[PDB]
Amino acid sequence: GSSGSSGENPRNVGSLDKTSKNVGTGLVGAPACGDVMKLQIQVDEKGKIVDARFKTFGCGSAIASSSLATEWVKGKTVEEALTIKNTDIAKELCLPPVKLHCSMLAEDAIKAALADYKLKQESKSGPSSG
């Protein structure tokens, strides 16, 4: 419910150097539920995900979907992740139709990661700094 409890600490939650390029950054939260899913994966020279970190803030459904998602990107390549869909996730966690926002949240995070990382590969410098 609204009153978020403090406990059941997550696992493997440690954002990566967002100041680098080899590691993309994907942050996707929920406007209604009010969540903050910060995903970050480190891509090697070959283009394979060697490191993956997820950080969810809000409802559990989000923390779970992520923890599981970020675990699927590990060992896989940026290309593979792009294939990863939310439908499967929702089923894996077996979340209700009310906590769907989370399911999609995971996928959105994954892509944002690889994508953002690619943007730097295609454009070293640009008019935007952010």
Which residues lie near Zn ion (CB under 5 A)? 33, 35, 58-59, 62
| SS3 call for 30 | strand
Q: Which two tokens mark 80? A: 């593979």
Could you tell me the strand order of the sheet in which 35-43 lies?
A: 23-30, 35-43, 49-55
Minimum distance from residue 63 beta carbon to Zn ion (Å)? 9
Nearer to Zn ion, 16 or 64 (CB): 64
Residue with tokens 């150097």: 17
Q: Which two tokens mark 18? A: 């967002």
d(CA 43, CA 46): 8
Nearer to Zn ion, 33 or 104 (CB): 33
94 flagged as catalytic: no
Minimum distance from residue 99 beta carbon to Zn ion (Å)? 6
Minimum distance from residue 36 beta carbon to Zn ion (Å)? 10
Q: Which of 33, 36, 82, 115 is catalytic?
A: 33
Q: Which two tokens mark 13? A: 């939650």
Nearer to Zn ion, 13 or 33 (CB): 33
Q: Which residues are annotated as a binding site?
A: 35, 59, 102
Active site residues: 33, 102
